[PDB]
Amino acid sequence: SKALGVLLAGPSGAERVGLKQGGTVQDAINWLTFDSFDIVKDGSKDVTADIMAACVVANDLGLDIKQNDGTYLVSGNPVWPVYNSLDLNGVTLKLAAGFTGYFALTQKDSTTVYGPTSPIVQAINAAGGRTAGSGVLEGLVNSTELNGKFLFMEGADVLYYSRGTAKYWWTNTYLSNRGKLSDNLKYGVSAITKITAVTPRTKIVYYRLPNLDFGNGPANNGVIRVLNNTRFIMQGGSISNRPLKDVSKSPVIISLNYCAAFKAYDFFDPYPAFAVDSNNSLVYSYTLNFNDIADAVFENFNSQGYGWGVVGGQRSTNITYRDCNLNRVDMHNPYMGYLKVLDTRLGTWGINASGMGDMYLERVTVDLDDSAHGGHREHEGIINARGDFGGFHDGGLYIKDLTIVGEASAFEATSGHPVALVSAYSFNAS
Amino acid sequence: SKALGVLLAGPSGAERVGLKQGGTVQDAINWLTFDSFDIVKDGSKDVTADIMAACVVANDLGLDIKQNDGTYLVSGNPVWPVYNSLDLNGVTLKLAAGFTGYFALTQKDSTTVYGPTSPIVQAINAAGGRTAGSGVLEGLVNSTELNGKFLFMEGADVLYYSRGTAKYWWTNTYLSNRGKLSDNLKYGVSAITKITAVTPRTKIVYYRLPNLDFGNGPANNGVIRVLNNTRFIMQGGSISNRPLKDVSKSPVIISLN
């Protein structure tokens, strides 16, 4: 009953063919493709569920996904999880008008959360080392539970006010062993309230992003999302057929959350989004948006033109921008450690970042043309602190070889004076 | 009739062999090699025409070429076109004495040229924004034709003289939308006479260059040529057995345009 051809077509078919160098064909091939599941790739059919099935099988088997051609139509709000490498260089995703899903790139089970009643937090709160400039937590000297992990901690002391809401103590750092922290605490804290620990990978994973088609104008809050991930390298990615106007929408492309020790590469956006409201006034929209990251490098990013700032950061540590082409480098919640902008071309927005660290600039060019915007200059200088956080920057600013081009004439017409070099103030002291 | 052995060896094939993780072998392999066309790779035969045929097949199917060993002897002046990634790390090319060909790495219809009589050019020449330090071409504010492209434009005003020949106004920049330029003009121009626009890829291609053997000493004007290309990464490449003297010759290795 079992005849050749029927056996070859089945799962145990590649192990029956031998190679000249040794082994079998099955031994050589160890990855999965979209074509392995017969997914329609001409854009004529919704394949949201088919891609969902493919990712589930790959995660169970722990294999990589490789696909270098085809165009796929997706709709709804799916959540595709990926636990390993993903290569989609050459693939175009055609998003529907109501699409609100996202790829979920995460490092399986790498995160542990400790509450205020955990023994770890109580041991820390009962010992010293919680002063300014401290680099050792004395409660973890004789413990190994948190060894070799990235820590995202929160405290109980109020630091500043934003929009009338109190913000509390926090710190992002790395612990090697016996309580030693890579980055020293800048301010003291009375008690710790929560700890998030992320374990680094034992392997490097590669993400090759596809091309996203925005013809129907989706407005999701992030199409590519990285959560609880370490030791990854992101390359490629682009946007196509972006609409000129985005009335009453706030599109976000890439979002990061609880990531450490990674580097990004040549993402290309032909021009940023231009989102307005019913009164034809600019609203927020980000190409990149991250929260709670540490030890990150961004290289050869391309998003330059009119519109809102394309970068939004919050509560990060040791961020570096090298050889980028962006219209703004921004940080809402203050950073800690250092913030480096090297060999980068900047747009009319400049740099808006409150911080508890040092800012470094080297060989940076700023273009001040803002003709498309009528007025609408939120901060009156080129290098600014956040006016919605009080306008503070508890650190120094060091600039080398800065070049200024343009005039920003549209702002001068409304206000009567040109922009300032450095500005630091608050919109409302209450 | 239609035996299994004959069926397996044809274009039908790996599609009939299944993988343990799912799908077929055909679904996993999506590239081409020089061994796929039985090209002699010991330097004992000229294979200039054989390499040309392989590049034609890959361009039609939109596949990548990958070869990691062998030495090939080439001669003449062929123009091998490549529209996708090319991986020749570990391959040696033996160039004949009179070899004058090159590899052509292109982008497959990414360039548009506008002359002085085109409507786009006349729109720019009728408006302002052509002054020194200008970063916006006011004649393209309401146009979307050149959005998201690299522009290589030329002018009509003489800037300087070299060897008795006048050189004219020029600038290279990028246009995002509604006339905004990434790099400002350093000098004003009375009129613009030609614009070349290049569209960036929606993908990243990789080029891994081979090793070139210059034992016979060819003097062609560029063995690796890149024309009208964007978003690529070039890696590797080397020269071996270069002669110590090159009397009455001027060799060029890599050229970009």
Automatic annotation (TrEMBL), chain A:
The chain holds residues 243 to 672 of 1017 of the full protein. It is found in: Virion. This is Probable tail spike protein. It comes from the Viruses.
